[PDB]
Scaffold this active site. Sequence first.
Site, PDB file in Angstrom:
ATOM      1  N   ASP A  35       0.827  -1.202   0.000  1.00  0.00           N
ATOM      2  CA  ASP A  35       0.000   0.000   0.000  1.00  0.00           C
ATOM      3  C   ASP A  35       0.862   1.254   0.000  1.00  0.00           C
ATOM      4  O   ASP A  35       1.353   1.658   1.050  1.00  0.00           O
ATOM      5  CB  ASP A  35      -0.890  -0.016   1.244  1.00  0.00           C
ATOM      6  CG  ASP A  35      -1.798   1.179   1.324  1.00  0.00           C
ATOM      7  OD1 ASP A  35      -1.925   1.883   0.305  1.00  0.00           O
ATOM      8  OD2 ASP A  35      -2.390   1.389   2.405  1.00  0.00           O
ATOM      9  N   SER A 199      -0.718  15.645 -11.967  1.00  0.00           N
ATOM     10  CA  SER A 199      -0.968  15.297 -13.347  1.00  0.00           C
ATOM     11  C   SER A 199      -1.215  16.569 -14.154  1.00  0.00           C
ATOM     12  O   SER A 199      -1.754  17.554 -13.652  1.00  0.00           O
ATOM     13  CB  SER A 199      -2.178  14.357 -13.421  1.00  0.00           C
ATOM     14  OG  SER A 199      -2.597  14.119 -14.750  1.00  0.00           O
TER      15      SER A 199
END
Length: 330
Positions: A35, A199
């Site tokens: 994770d 992004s």
Amino acid sequence: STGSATTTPIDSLDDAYITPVQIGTPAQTLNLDFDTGSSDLWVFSSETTASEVDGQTIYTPSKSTTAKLLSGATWSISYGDGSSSSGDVYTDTVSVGGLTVTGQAVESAKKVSSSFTEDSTIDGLLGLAFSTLNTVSPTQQKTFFDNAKASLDSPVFTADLGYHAPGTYNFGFIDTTAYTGSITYTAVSTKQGFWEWTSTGYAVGSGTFKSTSIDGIADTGTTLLYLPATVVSAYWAQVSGAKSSSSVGGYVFPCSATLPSFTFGVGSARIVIPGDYIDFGPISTGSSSCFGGIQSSAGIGINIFGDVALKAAFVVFNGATTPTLGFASK
């Protein structure tokens, strides 16, 4: 040193991925959920409340000659999905894909929430976010990666998740045969303890690319892609009959649909998520309403590039002094 381990979807939907991990002496192999959005290595154990264990493999520290109680240390974690676990702490030898760390904090669960009990395939979590998020008190502990880093050939790990197929986690090297083209690297902020990056935009299907900054986290422990409501609405508007259902808890779409792809930007590069990756199947057995793999982050407080996004790429988690993230197509 290096390590290389195969990671395997837990079910036919790729809800999560498990990777075998050797703990203790002799080895006890547990299948852990790696994770990159948390920083605790915790396991089902001989200390876990019996009624909260249902099929998991447990770590028994009393059977490990290298286990030592970390005296006074406790831990307690709550995840974004509302699940939780807590317990006490041992140090022991932990190996992943041939890479060994001695003195790793292994957090032994005394209690786990129902979602963990109900998932027989996940024996615990191995956190790969920054150690500043580790929950051990009163002495915070380091992640497996942080402990291994100095010994690694290169201070990196990579995630290569499969779509309905096994994939790989590598530590200490970049497998140049595992991706196509070049890797585009992008800046990371560690201020919140995550692999947080920005992004450069998105496209829906064959549509034009929208240049827009989307801050979010690369999180292998989250199944879906969670993005701003504007972006998510633009995606689902291209699927006839798709709608957001408050009763179901997100966007659903007719199971008869063909889903468009979704592209996200990494610098000037582009990663394309095929439409099929965005299908999470019937909302309940036999239903003709299907659950979407792109959902709104509104009210989470952060955008999450979970498995839906990451499995479309070869992803480099660069833990050099100034960390960065790399993405390549594959």
